[PDB]
Write a protein that binds this ligand. Structure first.
Ligand SMILES: Nc1nc2c(ncn2[C@@H]2O[C@H](COP(=O)(O)OP(=O)(O)O)[C@@H](O)[C@H]2O)c(=O)[nH]1
Ligand SMILES: [Mg+2]
Length: 396
């Protein structure tokens, strides 16, 4: 029940594909912790956090004009095609588009090779191939020789690529229009997937990743599967930043985000050093109070329950933003009030969190109060995200 073991034991409670950093790195930290040199130990923990936090992801998106590159980029960033910062949908060189909340996630819109006079290899060099983590090759219909050859070149250069077939919703709508209930919409998808794969393999790509989706319905088709696969292919430490940037499409995705964020709080908490003082004994320092307000804003944005996200959703709904906010809890925490009231409010949350969850550590050891409060806000915001998801699905 010693501290070093408790530190690593926390992470061991999460499933493999849900750990924030390699268990191997964590076990070395455990070793250093046992050594007792807090100087070196804190430094090692801070280094782990820095690697996670500093991770930058550069995603290349290529394909013919009109295939849906701009839309795909806006969808993953959670931005409407008509909002600012959004890649303008509609008919040069590459253009970057950073995620609005996670600047370290950058999508690059590349001009389709077909619009250039360059062979696959020259095209990739011109587009600064080595700057990307992976490539997304998009087509709204069938994949032409151009697209396929780029894929082969990328593969030959030892980088990952993914084929994304957009506008599948349009195919289903047009084929099903006026047809009896018996029309098989699922079969349309199954046929397109198999046909694409046969074509890819016929052309020399043995294991072509293919995803059929619609930029107008991120919750359906292969979008969820694509997100899981992209995260799975990334080095462990790079997953956190990309994960928190993803659209909050399912309870599973929301829960996965929470799991990653819980681990970051744990790391951050140990980096600040544990104490022997019970967390609910005193009020908070003003600096910690300000940090918590920033933390709440970040969590709300990550989970899509921030002001801007709420406005965007309820624009045309029968219930406006104020009605939507009334259905959740996080928006009320920091409504304007005096400093005493907010201090008293948080001093109660801390007692309640610890009475329900314990101190998460061996007897007499505690994280500084602010971290238990981050867990409290995280749970609150997570629950709000699920509540809102249900409301979104009923209406859109
Ligand atoms: N129905 C439907 N329309 C889409 C989809 N993706 C893109 N579009 C639309 O098709 C057009 C071309 O898309 P755009 O994203 O600008 O692709 P780009 O020209 O490759 O960058 C726009 O009118 C989009 O609104 C999709 O998955 N489904
Ligand atoms: Mg474009």
């Amino acid at each position: 029940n010693d501290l070093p073991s408790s530190f690593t034991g926390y992470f061991k409670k999460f499933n493999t594909g849900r750990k924030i950093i390699s268990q191997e790195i964590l076990n070395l930290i455990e070793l250093r912790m046992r050594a007792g040199n807090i100087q070196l130990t804190n430094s090692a923990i801070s280094d782990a956090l820095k690697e996670i936090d500093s991770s930058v992801l550069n995603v290349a998106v290529t394909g013919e004009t009109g295939s849906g590159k701009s839309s795909f980029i806006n969808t993953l960033r959670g931005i409407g095609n008509e909002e600012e910062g959004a890649a303008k949908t509609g008919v040069m060189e590459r253009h970057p588009y950073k995620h609005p909340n996670i600047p370290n996630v950058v999508f690059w819109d590349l001009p389709g090779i077909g619009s250039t006079n360059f062979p696959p290899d020259t095209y990739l060099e011109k587009m600064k191939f080595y700057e990307y983590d992976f490539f997304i090759i998009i087509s709204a219909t069938r994949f032409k020789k151009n697209d396929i050859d780029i894929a082969k070149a990328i593969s030959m250069m030892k980088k990952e690529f993914y084929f994304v077939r957009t506008k599948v919703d349009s195919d289903i709508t047009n084929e099903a229009d006026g047809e009896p209930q018996t029309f098989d919409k699922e079969k349309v998808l199954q046929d397109i997937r198999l046909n694409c794969v046969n074509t890819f393999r016929e052309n020399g790509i043995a294991e072509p990743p293919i995803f059929l989706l619609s930029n107008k319905n991120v919750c359906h088709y292969d979008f969820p599967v694509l997100m899981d696969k992209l995260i799975s292919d990334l080095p462990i430490y790079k997953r956190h930043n990309f994960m928190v940037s993803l659209p909050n499409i399912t309870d599973s995705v929301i829960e996965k985000k929470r799991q990653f964020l819980k681990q970051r709080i744990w790391l951050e908490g140990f980096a600040a050093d544990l104490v022997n003082i019970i967390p609910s004994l005193t009020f908070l320092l003003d600096s910690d109070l300000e940090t918590l307000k920033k933390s709440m804003k970040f969590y709300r944005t990550v989970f899509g329950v921030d002001e801007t996200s709420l406005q965007r959703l309820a624009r045309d709904w029968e219930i406006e933003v104020d009605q939507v906010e009334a259905m959740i809890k996080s928006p009320a925490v920091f409504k304007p009030t005096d400093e005493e009231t907010i201090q008293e409010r948080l001093s109660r949350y801390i007692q309640e969190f610890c009475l329900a969850n314990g101190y998460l550590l061996p007897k007499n050891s505690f994280l500084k109060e602010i971290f238990y409060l981050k867990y409290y806000f995280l749970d609150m915001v997570t629950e709000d995200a699920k509540t809102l998801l249900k409301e979104i699905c009923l209406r859109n």
